[PDB]
Tab-separated table of C-alpha atoms and ligand atoms in Angstrom:
chain	number	residue	atom	x	y	z
A	1	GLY	CA	19.092	-7.764	5.600
A	2	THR	CA	16.157	-7.041	3.283
A	3	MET	CA	14.381	-9.722	1.191
A	4	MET	CA	15.977	-8.439	-1.945
A	5	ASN	CA	19.413	-8.979	-0.535
A	6	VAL	CA	18.416	-12.458	0.665
A	7	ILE	CA	17.001	-13.433	-2.691
A	8	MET	CA	19.730	-11.822	-4.804
A	9	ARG	CA	22.247	-13.861	-2.807
A	10	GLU	CA	20.844	-16.993	-4.496
A	11	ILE	CA	20.646	-15.519	-7.983
A	12	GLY	CA	23.187	-17.799	-9.668
A	13	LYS	CA	21.901	-20.976	-7.979
A	14	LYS	CA	20.078	-23.974	-9.346
A	15	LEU	CA	16.794	-24.659	-7.634
A	16	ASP	CA	18.214	-27.609	-5.676
A	17	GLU	CA	21.121	-25.664	-4.131
A	18	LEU	CA	19.444	-22.691	-2.403
A	19	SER	CA	21.234	-21.746	0.809
A	20	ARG	CA	20.033	-22.465	4.371
A	21	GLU	CA	20.259	-18.725	5.055
A	22	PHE	CA	17.729	-18.150	2.307
A	23	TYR	CA	15.289	-20.667	3.738
A	24	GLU	CA	15.768	-19.126	7.160
A	25	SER	CA	14.407	-15.855	5.666
A	26	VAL	CA	11.710	-17.278	3.442
A	27	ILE	CA	10.191	-20.062	5.658
A	28	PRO	CA	7.394	-20.125	6.579
A	29	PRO	CA	5.005	-19.191	3.814
A	30	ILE	CA	1.829	-17.936	5.407
A	31	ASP	CA	-1.883	-17.943	4.632
A	32	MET	CA	-4.014	-15.301	6.286
A	33	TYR	CA	-7.756	-14.896	6.410
A	34	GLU	CA	-10.584	-13.827	8.739
A	35	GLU	CA	-13.494	-16.177	9.522
A	36	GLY	CA	-15.935	-16.555	12.421
A	37	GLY	CA	-14.887	-13.384	14.238
A	38	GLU	CA	-11.199	-14.329	14.486
A	39	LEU	CA	-8.027	-13.814	12.408
A	40	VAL	CA	-6.440	-17.023	11.153
A	41	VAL	CA	-2.746	-17.438	10.342
A	42	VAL	CA	-1.512	-20.672	8.694
A	43	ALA	CA	2.233	-21.517	8.392
A	44	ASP	CA	4.124	-24.325	6.682
A	45	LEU	CA	6.754	-25.001	9.304
A	46	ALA	CA	7.694	-28.701	9.123
A	47	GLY	CA	9.837	-30.632	11.602
A	48	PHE	CA	9.996	-28.508	14.730
A	49	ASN	CA	9.235	-29.458	18.345
A	50	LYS	CA	6.107	-27.849	19.748
A	51	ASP	CA	7.932	-26.716	22.879
A	52	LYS	CA	10.437	-25.059	20.542
A	53	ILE	CA	7.923	-22.890	18.700
A	54	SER	CA	6.959	-19.510	20.124
A	55	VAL	CA	4.124	-17.213	19.050
A	56	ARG	CA	3.871	-13.567	20.112
A	57	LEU	CA	1.551	-10.595	19.730
A	58	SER	CA	3.345	-7.263	19.640
A	59	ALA	CA	2.226	-3.968	21.087
A	60	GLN	CA	2.583	-2.924	17.475
A	61	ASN	CA	-0.021	-5.355	16.175
A	62	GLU	CA	2.638	-7.645	14.774
A	63	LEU	CA	2.520	-11.414	14.963
A	64	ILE	CA	5.885	-12.974	15.687
A	65	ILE	CA	6.614	-16.610	14.972
A	66	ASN	CA	9.797	-18.080	16.478
A	67	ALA	CA	11.138	-21.589	16.078
A	68	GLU	CA	14.437	-23.330	16.764
A	69	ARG	CA	15.842	-26.795	16.114
A	70	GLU	CA	19.178	-28.570	16.099
A	71	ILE	CA	20.216	-30.870	13.280
A	72	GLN	CA	23.400	-32.993	13.148
A	73	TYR	CA	24.012	-35.708	10.587
A	74	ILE	CA	26.384	-38.671	10.655
A	75	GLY	CA	28.327	-39.196	7.416
A	76	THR	CA	29.076	-37.237	4.252
A	77	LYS	CA	26.902	-34.097	3.930
A	78	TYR	CA	25.893	-32.825	0.482
A	79	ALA	CA	23.104	-30.323	1.100
A	80	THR	CA	22.024	-28.724	4.377
A	81	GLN	CA	19.227	-26.386	3.415
A	82	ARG	CA	16.635	-27.042	6.142
A	83	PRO	CA	16.466	-24.007	8.414
A	84	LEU	CA	17.560	-24.191	12.046
A	85	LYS	CA	16.236	-20.807	13.204
A	86	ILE	CA	13.025	-19.108	12.155
A	87	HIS	CA	11.981	-15.517	12.913
A	88	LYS	CA	8.815	-14.436	11.072
A	89	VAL	CA	7.282	-11.019	11.690
A	90	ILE	CA	3.757	-10.461	10.388
A	91	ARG	CA	2.064	-7.064	10.492
A	92	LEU	CA	-1.597	-7.649	11.391
A	93	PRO	CA	-4.265	-6.274	8.974
A	94	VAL	CA	-6.937	-5.747	11.625
A	95	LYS	CA	-6.568	-4.640	15.266
A	96	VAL	CA	-6.782	-7.411	17.858
A	97	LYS	CA	-8.307	-7.093	21.312
A	98	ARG	CA	-5.660	-6.626	23.993
A	99	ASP	CA	-7.261	-9.190	26.281
A	100	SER	CA	-8.220	-12.280	24.335
A	101	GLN	CA	-8.057	-16.042	24.142
A	102	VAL	CA	-5.814	-17.182	21.299
A	103	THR	CA	-5.818	-20.695	19.949
A	104	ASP	CA	-3.094	-22.492	18.031
A	105	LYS	CA	-2.603	-26.009	16.616
A	106	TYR	CA	0.552	-27.729	15.266
A	107	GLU	CA	-0.087	-30.794	13.129
A	108	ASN	CA	1.496	-32.327	10.006
A	109	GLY	CA	4.121	-29.572	10.107
A	110	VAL	CA	1.423	-26.906	9.824
A	111	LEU	CA	1.064	-24.110	12.357
A	112	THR	CA	-2.482	-22.708	12.552
A	113	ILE	CA	-3.167	-19.692	14.768
A	114	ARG	CA	-6.559	-18.203	15.654
A	115	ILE	CA	-6.785	-14.687	17.023
A	116	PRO	CA	-10.090	-13.047	18.026
A	117	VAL	CA	-10.835	-9.549	16.684
B	1	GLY	CA	22.136	15.443	-10.781
B	2	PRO	CA	19.073	13.995	-12.525
B	3	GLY	CA	19.442	10.543	-10.962
B	4	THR	CA	19.314	7.143	-12.644
B	5	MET	CA	16.782	4.683	-13.883
B	6	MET	CA	19.090	1.990	-12.503
B	7	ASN	CA	18.428	3.110	-8.925
B	8	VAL	CA	14.731	3.362	-9.701
B	9	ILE	CA	14.707	-0.163	-11.064
B	10	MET	CA	16.675	-1.501	-8.097
B	11	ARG	CA	14.340	0.205	-5.679
B	12	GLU	CA	11.351	-1.292	-7.464
B	13	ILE	CA	12.799	-4.821	-7.524
B	14	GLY	CA	13.113	-4.508	-3.766
B	15	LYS	CA	9.472	-3.592	-3.388
B	16	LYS	CA	8.461	-6.505	-5.579
B	17	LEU	CA	10.549	-8.972	-3.541
B	18	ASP	CA	9.206	-7.665	-0.253
B	19	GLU	CA	6.141	-9.910	-0.220
B	20	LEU	CA	6.562	-13.260	-1.933
B	21	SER	CA	3.880	-15.135	-3.909
B	22	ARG	CA	2.585	-18.690	-3.700
B	23	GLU	CA	4.156	-19.389	-7.111
B	24	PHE	CA	7.499	-18.439	-5.625
B	25	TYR	CA	7.070	-20.951	-2.806
B	26	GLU	CA	5.940	-23.604	-5.273
B	27	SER	CA	9.333	-23.277	-6.949
B	28	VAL	CA	11.588	-23.229	-3.829
B	29	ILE	CA	9.855	-25.632	-1.438
B	30	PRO	CA	11.052	-28.085	-0.127
B	31	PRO	CA	14.472	-27.240	1.286
B	32	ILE	CA	16.464	-30.439	1.597
B	33	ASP	CA	19.218	-31.944	3.668
B	34	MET	CA	21.176	-34.629	1.869
B	35	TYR	CA	23.687	-36.998	3.449
B	36	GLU	CA	25.313	-40.404	2.904
B	37	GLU	CA	26.221	-42.972	5.582
B	38	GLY	CA	26.585	-46.749	5.674
B	39	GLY	CA	26.122	-47.052	1.949
B	40	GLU	CA	22.855	-45.128	2.068
B	41	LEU	CA	21.898	-41.719	0.650
B	42	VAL	CA	19.292	-39.903	2.737
B	43	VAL	CA	17.220	-36.932	1.606
B	44	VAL	CA	15.257	-34.975	4.213
B	45	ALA	CA	12.694	-32.424	2.945
B	46	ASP	CA	10.556	-29.929	4.809
B	47	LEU	CA	7.186	-30.459	3.118
B	48	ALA	CA	4.464	-29.502	5.623
B	49	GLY	CA	0.754	-30.113	5.260
B	50	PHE	CA	0.356	-32.633	2.519
B	51	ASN	CA	-1.459	-35.979	2.365
B	52	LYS	CA	0.718	-39.095	1.951
B	53	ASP	CA	-1.494	-40.130	-0.965
B	54	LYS	CA	-0.831	-36.856	-2.769
B	55	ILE	CA	2.966	-36.977	-2.706
B	56	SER	CA	5.150	-38.807	-5.229
B	57	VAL	CA	8.865	-39.549	-5.339
B	58	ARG	CA	10.546	-40.487	-8.626
B	59	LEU	CA	14.111	-41.550	-9.383
B	60	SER	CA	15.030	-40.592	-12.946
B	61	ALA	CA	17.495	-42.034	-15.455
B	62	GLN	CA	19.569	-38.852	-14.978
B	63	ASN	CA	20.385	-39.684	-11.316
B	64	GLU	CA	17.764	-37.141	-10.214
B	65	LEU	CA	15.243	-37.358	-7.385
B	66	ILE	CA	11.853	-35.845	-8.175
B	67	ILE	CA	9.462	-34.842	-5.422
B	68	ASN	CA	5.854	-34.149	-6.371
B	69	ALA	CA	2.959	-33.010	-4.227
B	70	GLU	CA	-0.377	-31.328	-4.619
B	71	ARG	CA	-3.112	-30.201	-2.305
B	72	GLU	CA	-6.214	-28.057	-2.285
B	73	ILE	CA	-6.614	-25.218	0.178
B	74	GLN	CA	-10.046	-23.779	0.914
B	75	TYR	CA	-10.367	-20.045	1.637
B	76	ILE	CA	-13.491	-18.537	3.216
B	77	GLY	CA	-13.919	-14.941	4.302
B	78	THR	CA	-11.458	-12.123	3.704
B	79	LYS	CA	-8.066	-13.504	2.638
B	80	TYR	CA	-5.083	-11.205	3.223
B	81	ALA	CA	-2.170	-13.513	2.305
B	82	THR	CA	-2.022	-16.765	0.311
B	83	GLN	CA	1.654	-17.837	0.267
B	84	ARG	CA	1.319	-21.564	0.953
B	85	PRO	CA	1.960	-23.616	-2.209
B	86	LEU	CA	-0.668	-25.859	-3.771
B	87	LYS	CA	1.589	-27.718	-6.147
B	88	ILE	CA	5.187	-28.928	-5.693
B	89	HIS	CA	7.647	-30.199	-8.272
B	90	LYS	CA	11.187	-30.345	-6.883
B	91	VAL	CA	13.980	-31.728	-9.021
B	92	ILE	CA	17.135	-32.736	-7.152
B	93	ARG	CA	20.409	-33.818	-8.757
B	94	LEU	CA	21.810	-36.722	-6.741
B	95	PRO	CA	25.434	-36.304	-5.533
B	96	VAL	CA	26.307	-40.016	-5.588
B	97	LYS	CA	25.348	-42.832	-7.988
B	98	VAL	CA	22.380	-44.757	-6.622
B	99	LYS	CA	20.878	-48.207	-7.246
B	100	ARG	CA	17.536	-47.872	-9.033
B	101	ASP	CA	17.084	-51.661	-8.832
B	102	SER	CA	17.289	-51.950	-5.033
B	103	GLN	CA	14.486	-51.131	-2.599
B	104	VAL	CA	13.914	-47.464	-1.753
B	105	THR	CA	12.359	-46.567	1.616
B	106	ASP	CA	10.673	-43.296	2.602
B	107	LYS	CA	8.535	-41.876	5.400
B	108	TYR	CA	6.396	-38.823	6.057
B	109	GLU	CA	6.172	-37.600	9.668
B	110	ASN	CA	5.647	-34.130	11.176
B	111	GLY	CA	5.594	-32.644	7.658
B	112	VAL	CA	9.035	-34.093	7.009
B	113	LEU	CA	9.672	-36.394	4.062
B	114	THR	CA	12.679	-38.714	4.418
B	115	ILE	CA	14.013	-40.773	1.514
B	116	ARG	CA	16.559	-43.508	2.065
B	117	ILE	CA	18.427	-44.628	-1.032
B	118	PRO	CA	21.021	-47.417	-1.396
B	119	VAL	CA	24.257	-46.225	-2.953
B	120	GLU	CA	26.026	-48.182	-5.665
B	121	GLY	CA	29.279	-49.473	-4.209
B	122	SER	CA	29.648	-52.037	-6.968
B	123	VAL	CA	28.933	-52.441	-10.686
B	124	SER	CA	25.620	-50.858	-11.692
B	125	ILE	CA	22.623	-52.870	-12.891
B	126	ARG	CA	19.754	-51.588	-15.048
B	127	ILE	CA	16.669	-53.801	-15.081
B	128	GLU	CA	14.902	-52.130	-18.025
C	1	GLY	CA	16.876	-30.664	-14.631
C	2	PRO	CA	16.515	-28.544	-11.496
C	3	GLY	CA	15.004	-25.177	-12.247
C	4	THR	CA	16.961	-21.961	-12.166
C	5	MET	CA	16.603	-19.448	-9.330
C	6	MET	CA	17.096	-16.596	-11.760
C	7	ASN	CA	14.055	-17.514	-13.843
C	8	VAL	CA	12.086	-17.752	-10.590
C	9	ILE	CA	13.174	-14.259	-9.546
C	10	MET	CA	12.404	-12.893	-13.048
C	11	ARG	CA	8.939	-14.428	-12.998
C	12	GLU	CA	8.358	-13.109	-9.502
C	13	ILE	CA	9.271	-9.520	-10.386
C	14	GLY	CA	7.671	-9.528	-13.848
C	15	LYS	CA	4.108	-10.435	-12.888
C	16	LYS	CA	4.003	-7.647	-10.303
C	17	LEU	CA	5.164	-4.934	-12.640
C	18	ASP	CA	1.685	-4.083	-13.984
C	19	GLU	CA	1.196	-2.361	-10.649
C	20	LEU	CA	4.083	0.027	-10.050
C	21	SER	CA	4.758	1.877	-6.827
C	22	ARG	CA	4.142	5.487	-5.925
C	23	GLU	CA	7.917	6.003	-5.383
C	24	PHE	CA	8.516	4.826	-8.976
C	25	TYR	CA	6.124	7.469	-10.332
C	26	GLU	CA	7.650	10.054	-7.965
C	27	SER	CA	10.865	9.329	-9.769
C	28	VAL	CA	9.703	9.431	-13.361
C	29	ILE	CA	6.908	12.053	-13.352
C	30	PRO	CA	6.850	14.327	-15.160
C	31	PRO	CA	7.751	13.435	-18.687
C	32	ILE	CA	8.853	16.569	-20.537
C	33	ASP	CA	9.024	18.036	-23.970
C	34	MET	CA	11.920	20.408	-24.519
C	35	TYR	CA	12.521	22.748	-27.432
C	36	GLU	CA	14.124	26.079	-28.245
C	37	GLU	CA	11.890	28.622	-29.909
C	38	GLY	CA	12.313	32.344	-30.285
C	39	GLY	CA	15.501	32.619	-28.270
C	40	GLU	CA	13.979	30.887	-25.259
C	41	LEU	CA	13.990	27.291	-24.021
C	42	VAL	CA	10.522	25.786	-23.550
C	43	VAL	CA	9.847	22.934	-21.146
C	44	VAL	CA	6.448	21.262	-21.165
C	45	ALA	CA	5.579	18.885	-18.282
C	46	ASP	CA	2.609	16.530	-17.815
C	47	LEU	CA	2.051	17.200	-14.074
C	48	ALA	CA	-1.664	16.551	-13.357
C	49	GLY	CA	-3.573	17.159	-10.146
C	50	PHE	CA	-1.445	19.676	-8.336
C	51	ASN	CA	-2.169	23.043	-6.856
C	52	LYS	CA	-0.412	25.867	-8.693
C	53	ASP	CA	0.951	27.252	-5.445
C	54	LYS	CA	2.488	23.879	-4.573
C	55	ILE	CA	4.456	23.686	-7.814
C	56	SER	CA	7.844	25.401	-7.699
C	57	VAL	CA	10.546	25.867	-10.365
C	58	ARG	CA	14.242	26.539	-9.945
C	59	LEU	CA	17.433	26.807	-11.919
C	60	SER	CA	20.615	25.140	-10.776
C	61	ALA	CA	24.174	26.500	-10.931
C	62	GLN	CA	24.982	23.485	-13.059
C	63	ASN	CA	22.565	24.612	-15.845
C	64	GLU	CA	19.755	22.340	-14.598
C	65	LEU	CA	16.023	22.958	-14.322
C	66	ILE	CA	14.367	21.632	-11.162
C	67	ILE	CA	10.642	20.986	-10.977
C	68	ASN	CA	9.337	20.519	-7.443
C	69	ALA	CA	5.759	19.716	-6.541
C	70	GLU	CA	3.870	18.477	-3.492
C	71	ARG	CA	0.388	17.347	-2.633
C	72	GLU	CA	-1.527	15.133	-0.237
C	73	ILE	CA	-4.164	12.626	-1.308
C	74	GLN	CA	-6.817	12.735	1.395
C	75	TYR	CA	-9.276	10.226	-0.109
C	76	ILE	CA	-10.875	7.749	2.320
C	77	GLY	CA	-12.293	4.321	1.446
C	78	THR	CA	-10.913	0.813	1.152
C	79	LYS	CA	-7.787	1.416	-0.958
C	80	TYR	CA	-6.681	-1.089	-3.610
C	81	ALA	CA	-3.905	0.931	-5.267
C	82	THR	CA	-1.767	3.963	-4.391
C	83	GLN	CA	0.229	4.712	-7.569
C	84	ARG	CA	-0.264	8.539	-7.795
C	85	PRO	CA	2.758	10.567	-6.605
C	86	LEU	CA	2.783	12.903	-3.618
C	87	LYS	CA	6.133	14.541	-3.983
C	88	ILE	CA	7.920	15.516	-7.215
C	89	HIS	CA	11.584	16.442	-7.525
C	90	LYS	CA	12.832	16.401	-11.086
C	91	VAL	CA	16.190	17.669	-12.278
C	92	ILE	CA	16.604	18.341	-16.037
C	93	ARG	CA	19.900	19.029	-17.790
C	94	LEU	CA	19.372	22.021	-20.057
C	95	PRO	CA	20.828	21.634	-23.599
C	96	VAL	CA	21.689	25.340	-23.953
C	97	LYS	CA	23.186	27.965	-21.594
C	98	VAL	CA	20.548	30.084	-19.959
C	99	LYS	CA	20.884	33.846	-19.591
C	100	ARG	CA	20.797	34.031	-15.804
C	101	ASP	CA	19.582	37.582	-15.933
C	102	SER	CA	16.209	36.882	-17.473
C	103	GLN	CA	12.758	36.271	-16.060
C	104	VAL	CA	11.391	32.743	-16.218
C	105	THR	CA	7.678	32.384	-16.977
C	106	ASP	CA	5.578	29.339	-16.026
C	107	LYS	CA	1.945	28.589	-16.850
C	108	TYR	CA	-0.111	25.693	-15.441
C	109	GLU	CA	-3.276	24.514	-17.207
C	110	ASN	CA	-4.919	21.101	-17.753
C	111	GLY	CA	-2.238	19.547	-15.525
C	112	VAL	CA	0.361	20.736	-18.032
C	113	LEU	CA	3.183	22.963	-16.849
C	114	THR	CA	4.816	25.147	-19.517
C	115	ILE	CA	8.081	26.922	-18.691
C	116	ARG	CA	9.904	29.398	-20.908
C	117	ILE	CA	13.561	30.171	-20.239
C	118	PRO	CA	15.404	32.847	-22.221
C	119	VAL	CA	18.731	31.566	-23.425
C	120	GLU	CA	22.121	32.830	-24.421
C	121	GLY	CA	23.161	32.375	-28.029
C	122	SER	CA	24.866	33.902	-31.041
C	123	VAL	CA	25.030	33.399	-34.811
C	124	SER	CA	27.865	30.990	-35.675
C	125	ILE	CA	30.660	32.488	-37.816
C	126	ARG	CA	33.375	30.733	-39.840
C	127	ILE	CA	35.658	33.254	-41.588
D	1	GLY	CA	1.584	-9.686	-22.570
D	2	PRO	CA	3.354	-10.692	-19.326
D	3	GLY	CA	6.973	-9.577	-19.223
D	4	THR	CA	6.025	-6.683	-21.512
D	5	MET	CA	6.233	-4.279	-18.526
D	6	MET	CA	9.595	-5.777	-17.622
D	7	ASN	CA	10.930	-5.101	-21.099
D	8	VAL	CA	9.483	-1.600	-21.122
D	9	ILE	CA	11.254	-0.686	-17.902
D	10	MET	CA	14.492	-2.524	-18.684
D	11	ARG	CA	14.733	-0.637	-22.016
D	12	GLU	CA	15.519	2.557	-20.062
D	13	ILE	CA	18.388	0.892	-18.122
D	14	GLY	CA	21.440	3.093	-18.323
D	15	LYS	CA	19.488	6.269	-18.806
D	16	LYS	CA	19.257	9.236	-16.465
D	17	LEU	CA	15.754	10.145	-15.250
D	18	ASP	CA	16.287	13.091	-17.584
D	19	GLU	CA	16.073	11.232	-20.836
D	20	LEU	CA	13.476	8.474	-20.477
D	21	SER	CA	11.815	7.542	-23.787
D	22	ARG	CA	8.311	8.465	-24.946
D	23	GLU	CA	7.547	4.794	-25.391
D	24	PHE	CA	8.352	4.282	-21.703
D	25	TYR	CA	5.842	6.904	-20.565
D	26	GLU	CA	3.418	5.550	-23.106
D	27	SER	CA	3.384	2.216	-21.265
D	28	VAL	CA	3.598	3.613	-17.797
D	29	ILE	CA	1.171	6.597	-17.922
D	30	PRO	CA	-1.091	7.052	-16.108
D	31	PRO	CA	-0.458	6.169	-12.470
D	32	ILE	CA	-3.818	5.423	-10.844
D	33	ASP	CA	-5.540	5.226	-7.528
D	34	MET	CA	-8.210	2.606	-6.884
D	35	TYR	CA	-10.564	2.538	-3.951
D	36	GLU	CA	-14.209	1.790	-3.269
D	37	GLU	CA	-16.606	4.003	-1.339
D	38	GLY	CA	-20.327	3.312	-1.620
D	39	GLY	CA	-21.640	1.123	-4.419
D	40	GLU	CA	-19.192	2.682	-6.852
D	41	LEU	CA	-15.471	1.989	-7.192
D	42	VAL	CA	-13.404	5.082	-7.987
D	43	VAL	CA	-10.310	5.226	-10.192
D	44	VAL	CA	-8.146	8.353	-10.079
D	45	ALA	CA	-5.611	8.586	-12.956
D	46	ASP	CA	-3.048	11.356	-13.652
D	47	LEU	CA	-3.563	12.002	-17.369
D	48	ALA	CA	-2.402	15.593	-18.018
D	49	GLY	CA	-2.720	17.412	-21.321
D	50	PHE	CA	-5.450	15.523	-23.042
D	51	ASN	CA	-8.621	16.494	-24.834
D	52	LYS	CA	-11.703	15.077	-23.096
D	53	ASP	CA	-13.263	14.032	-26.393
D	54	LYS	CA	-10.140	12.074	-27.302
D	55	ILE	CA	-10.187	10.215	-23.964
D	56	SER	CA	-12.033	6.879	-24.170
D	57	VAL	CA	-12.919	4.293	-21.524
D	58	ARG	CA	-14.465	0.843	-21.974
D	59	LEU	CA	-15.102	-2.210	-19.810
D	60	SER	CA	-13.813	-5.499	-21.146
D	61	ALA	CA	-15.226	-8.986	-21.590
D	62	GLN	CA	-12.455	-10.299	-19.317
D	63	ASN	CA	-13.649	-7.610	-16.825
D	64	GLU	CA	-10.413	-5.612	-17.237
D	65	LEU	CA	-11.029	-1.810	-17.359
D	66	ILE	CA	-9.529	-0.075	-20.373
D	67	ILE	CA	-8.423	3.538	-20.573
D	68	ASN	CA	-7.683	5.000	-23.987
D	69	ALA	CA	-6.329	8.399	-24.983
D	70	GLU	CA	-4.731	9.960	-28.019
D	71	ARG	CA	-3.290	13.347	-28.779
D	72	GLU	CA	-0.918	15.272	-30.934
D	73	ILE	CA	1.848	17.542	-29.779
D	74	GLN	CA	3.143	20.587	-31.602
D	75	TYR	CA	6.652	21.992	-31.595
D	76	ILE	CA	7.956	25.098	-33.282
D	77	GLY	CA	11.703	25.223	-32.844
D	78	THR	CA	14.668	22.979	-32.253
D	79	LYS	CA	13.562	19.789	-30.479
D	80	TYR	CA	15.676	18.501	-27.648
D	81	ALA	CA	13.301	16.020	-25.983
D	82	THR	CA	9.912	14.539	-26.696
D	83	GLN	CA	8.990	12.312	-23.790
D	84	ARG	CA	5.339	13.191	-23.457
D	85	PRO	CA	3.167	10.276	-24.599
D	86	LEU	CA	0.975	10.595	-27.685
D	87	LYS	CA	-1.031	7.386	-27.353
D	88	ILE	CA	-2.285	5.959	-24.037
D	89	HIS	CA	-3.692	2.431	-23.612
D	90	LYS	CA	-4.029	1.307	-19.997
D	91	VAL	CA	-5.607	-2.024	-19.032
D	92	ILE	CA	-6.565	-2.205	-15.374
D	93	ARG	CA	-7.461	-5.456	-13.591
D	94	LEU	CA	-10.584	-4.885	-11.510
D	95	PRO	CA	-10.421	-6.290	-7.896
D	96	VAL	CA	-14.216	-6.371	-7.385
D	97	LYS	CA	-16.456	-8.549	-9.606
D	98	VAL	CA	-18.124	-6.850	-12.621
D	99	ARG	CA	-22.658	-6.985	-15.846
D	100	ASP	CA	-22.276	-3.863	-18.021
D	101	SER	CA	-23.077	-0.703	-16.041
D	102	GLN	CA	-23.188	3.111	-16.117
D	103	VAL	CA	-19.757	4.690	-15.856
D	104	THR	CA	-19.135	8.274	-14.744
D	105	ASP	CA	-15.931	10.117	-15.643
D	106	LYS	CA	-14.925	13.682	-14.862
D	107	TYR	CA	-11.723	15.061	-16.380
D	108	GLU	CA	-10.345	18.063	-14.538
D	109	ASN	CA	-6.820	19.466	-14.056
D	110	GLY	CA	-5.412	16.592	-16.129
D	111	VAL	CA	-6.905	14.222	-13.584
D	112	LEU	CA	-9.286	11.544	-14.781
D	113	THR	CA	-11.658	10.471	-12.022
D	114	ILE	CA	-13.951	7.598	-12.816
D	115	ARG	CA	-16.612	5.824	-10.756
D	116	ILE	CA	-17.775	2.277	-11.590
D	117	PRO	CA	-20.601	0.612	-9.657
D	118	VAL	CA	-20.205	-3.063	-8.813
D	119	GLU	CA	-22.660	-5.299	-6.960
E	1	CL	CL1	11.108	-11.600	19.411
E	2	CL	CL1	7.817	-35.807	-13.161
E	3	CL	CL1	-8.494	-1.664	-28.573
């Protein structure tokens, strides 16, 4: 549910055995700043397909990042921490114009989003 | 009923875990997948936005894999959130015994670091 | 070896504790002094920045004192911290039985709330 | 230094909100509000029951803002609880950059309101 519950779930773990469920809550970390008249969001979101990443602006001034991937490995599996599904809701600091041109770029695993304000 | 400090503390922990800091991500990133097939151990790590030259992989004498990375991120203008990690030091305990002597391959594509490691199926050799 | 998650969580909570939430202070304000003098129980509460009409005081069936208080912080500007409480509900176990028949007096000055509660009591005898 | 607040809070684990220690409130009082309007930055702190003369504020080398206060409390009777803090030392990290400047404080209704002007 909450972050606290997510994080407390991992409380007795070593740092190399954190659950997938935890990374599905915590990924992606996000940088946010405003420069040149637009609001810029930057996400570390490695190893997804561009057609499998969705970005959304809510009525509620929330930025929603969605991503999905499938991962199947041949052989003996020892750790499967990399997240399959991502759902990141970001409340926006400053109001964004309803009609706007929004730019995004996905490179080197990094998702950069530019929203005019 | 006066209520308890315990609940107060719990409630406050919750608030503090609600938004997570860069230092927190520096300690948990990368998440890894780890699997063995055809006498190879593979580690796959989500490690977006680094330069190949700034990443290091080290195999220790304790059968551990060490992933290191560092970057600089420039912030201009008002900055509301700064979660993305600048420095990475992930220590992974390897599930199977691996051959330090043999050749280790890795690659870095789409933010994903992959490390292929030969597994010891024989008698171990130490070259030092 | 590999770090511990626990230490990470500890570190993460610890460094944020210098700034504590409004809800935390709504839980712990006010601190009180309590002492019996002159056949009445005296409760002294550090409760700054309230309007005297917004403070209310009650006495439970379970021999508790309840100190309620409410206020709104209007202040406009670019906020950096919001620690100060808005609503106060504090329930205090009273160490002696109160005479439920008697008038309770409360004074409020310098943010300090003083409450005097007449109590029931008798000289102890061992014949 | 760091982790001191953790220890302060964790010391009251297992207590009812009824019976929190003086030392707790000594570390935790006062709650503050911080916000900038105009050139000055205003700090509103709930610091009931002090004597204005006894209240001291300085600005630090590290640019932390320091609030000091001391007082005595008097009881005639049987004491059941003494939570109210006697000595207050609050170090506040300043968000805006500092250059020693004029500071204005007004202490009314137990509320300390201070204005600091930063460039
Ligand atoms: Cl959605
Ligand atoms: Cl190392
Ligand atoms: Cl000093």
